[PDB]
Amino acid sequence: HLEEHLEKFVENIRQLGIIVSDFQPSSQAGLNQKLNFIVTGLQDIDKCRQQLHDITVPLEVFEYIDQGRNPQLYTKECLERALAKNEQVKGKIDTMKKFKSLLIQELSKVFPEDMAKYRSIR
Amino acid sequence: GPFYLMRELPGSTELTGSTNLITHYNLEQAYNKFCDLPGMIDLPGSHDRSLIEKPPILSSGTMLAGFRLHTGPL
Amino acid sequence: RLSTLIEFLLHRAYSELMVLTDLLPRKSDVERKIEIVQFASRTRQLFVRLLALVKWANNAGKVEKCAMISSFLDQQAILFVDTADRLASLARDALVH
């Protein structure tokens, strides 16, 4: 959206102002103040846009941003852990299924009519 | 003949945990993509009270201001 | 949940800007410059945090799917053990009576 572009432009303006003010400025010092005011206005606009959009975020995202890292790795980790949970669930499901099948075929001779009715009803 | 207290088993395959829940929930291509952004952020800028900002985020007059404070050039 | 964080960040940034503006005229040129560049670095940190938030804002689907899938299994996990526990409880007490 336009809010991200405004934030990037404000950050670039702040970086340029910091680069200009790193040494002694022979020109007037009001340019940095004007850039700071523009950055504050852009931040206010971005805050208003975020309030309108109403994004909901958890805390784990906050401590993940605190260290500093793109969320793509976190989404990869979530996908791989969900896939691992799915694989172990599939494993337990197929093990109980094969256990049921082996106990059914193992004791097929105890009462043929019961097995016939079980197969018919299924 | 009939055994005591037989009843009807549920619908043959309703929603279970034995299905592939992700591919049914249309999330496959994101995973196939996925399987630092500070660095991503770093490319745009330089590098990536960072102690102070976190604390501020943990809890959760532009023209006039400029006129009010004057900073010596040298 | 990000609206309160954004409002708090805006208030903190405004307070820091006001404090720096008040301190700059009283302090010397070098101290004022150091305070201004430190405030610029802090605002840059806030900006990159906001950028990370708004980049993840559209990437909130897959994490939610993984979380609900994990909960389903976890919710289910309590159920299988509970059924097993009931069977175990019955053998121990109901059979004896």
UniProtKB/Swiss-Prot annotation, chain A:
Family: Belongs to the Mediator complex subunit 10 family.
Organism expressing this protein natively: Homo sapiens (Human)
GO molecular function, one term: transcription coregulator activity
Protein's name in the database: Mediator of RNA polymerase II transcription subunit 10
A GO cellular-component term linked to this record: core mediator complex
GO BP of this protein: positive regulation of transcription elongation by RNA polymerase II; positive regulation of transcription initiation by RNA polymerase II; protein ubiquitination; RNA polymerase II preinitiation complex assembly; somatic stem cell population maintenance
Entry keyword set: Activator, Nucleus, Transcription, Transcription regulation
Pfam family, one: Med10
Assembly, per entry: Component of the Mediator complex, which is composed of MED1, MED4, MED6, MED7, MED8, MED9, MED10, MED11, MED12, MED13, MED13L, MED14, MED15, MED16, MED17, MED18, MED19, MED20, MED21, MED22, MED23, MED24, MED25, MED26, MED27, MED29, MED30, MED31, CCNC, CDK8 and CDC2L6/CDK11. The MED12, MED13, CCNC and CDK8 subunits form a distinct module termed the CDK8 module. Mediator containing the CDK8 module is less active than Mediator lacking this module in supporting transcriptional activation.
Gene: MED10
UniProt cross-references to InterPro entries, sorted A to Z: Mediator_Med10 (IPR019145)
Lineage: Eukaryota, Metazoa, Chordata, Craniata, Vertebrata
Principal cellular location given in the protein's record: nucleus
Localization annotation: Nucleus
Role played: Component of the Mediator complex, a coactivator involved in the regulated transcription of nearly all RNA polymerase II-dependent genes. Mediator functions as a bridge to convey information from gene-specific regulatory proteins to the basal RNA polymerase II transcription machinery. Mediator is recruited to promoters by direct interactions with regulatory proteins and serves as a scaffold for the assembly of a functional preinitiation complex with RNA polymerase II and the general transcription factors.
UniProtKB/Swiss-Prot annotation, chain B:
Protein family (similarity comment): Belongs to the Mediator complex subunit 19 family.
Shown residues in whole-protein numbering: 63 to 159 of 244
Name recorded for this polypeptide: Mediator of RNA polymerase II transcription subunit 19
Location(s), subcellular: Nucleus
Superkingdom field: Eukaryota
Known partners and oligomeric status: Component of the Mediator complex, which is composed of MED1, MED4, MED6, MED7, MED8, MED9, MED10, MED11, MED12, MED13, MED13L, MED14, MED15, MED16, MED17, MED18, MED19, MED20, MED21, MED22, MED23, MED24, MED25, MED26, MED27, MED29, MED30, MED31, CCNC, CDK8 and CDC2L6/CDK11. The MED12, MED13, CCNC and CDK8 subunits form a distinct module termed the CDK8 module. Mediator containing the CDK8 module is less active than Mediator lacking this module in supporting transcriptional activation.
Functional summary from the UniProt entry: Component of the Mediator complex, a coactivator involved in the regulated transcription of nearly all RNA polymerase II-dependent genes. Mediator functions as a bridge to convey information from gene-specific regulatory proteins to the basal RNA polymerase II transcription machinery. Mediator is recruited to promoters by direct interactions with regulatory proteins and serves as a scaffold for the assembly of a functional preinitiation complex with RNA polymerase II and the general transcription factors.
Organism of provenance: Homo sapiens
Curated annotation (Swiss-Prot), chain C:
Compartments it resides in: Nucleus
Cystines in this chain: none
Transmembrane segments: none
Short sequence motif LXXLL motif 1: positions: 20-24
Domain of life (superkingdom): Eukaryota
Tissue: Ubiquitous.
Subunit structure: Interacts with GATA1. Component of the Mediator complex, which is composed of MED1, MED4, MED6, MED7, MED8, MED9, MED10, MED11, MED12, MED13, MED13L, MED14, MED15, MED16, MED17, MED18, MED19, MED20, MED21, MED22, MED23, MED24, MED25, MED26, MED27, MED29, MED30, MED31, CCNC, CDK8 and CDC2L6/CDK11. The MED12, MED13, CCNC and CDK8 subunits form a distinct module termed the CDK8 module. Mediator containing the CDK8 module is less active than Mediator lacking this module in supporting transcriptional activation.
Family indicated by similarity: Belongs to the Mediator complex subunit 14 family.
Protein purpose: Component of the Mediator complex, a coactivator involved in the regulated transcription of nearly all RNA polymerase II-dependent genes. Mediator functions as a bridge to convey information from gene-specific regulatory proteins to the basal RNA polymerase II transcription machinery. Mediator is recruited to promoters by direct interactions with regulatory proteins and serves as a scaffold for the assembly of a functional preinitiation complex with RNA polymerase II and the general transcription factors.
The name this protein goes by in its record: Mediator of RNA polymerase II transcription subunit 14
Biological source species: Homo sapiens
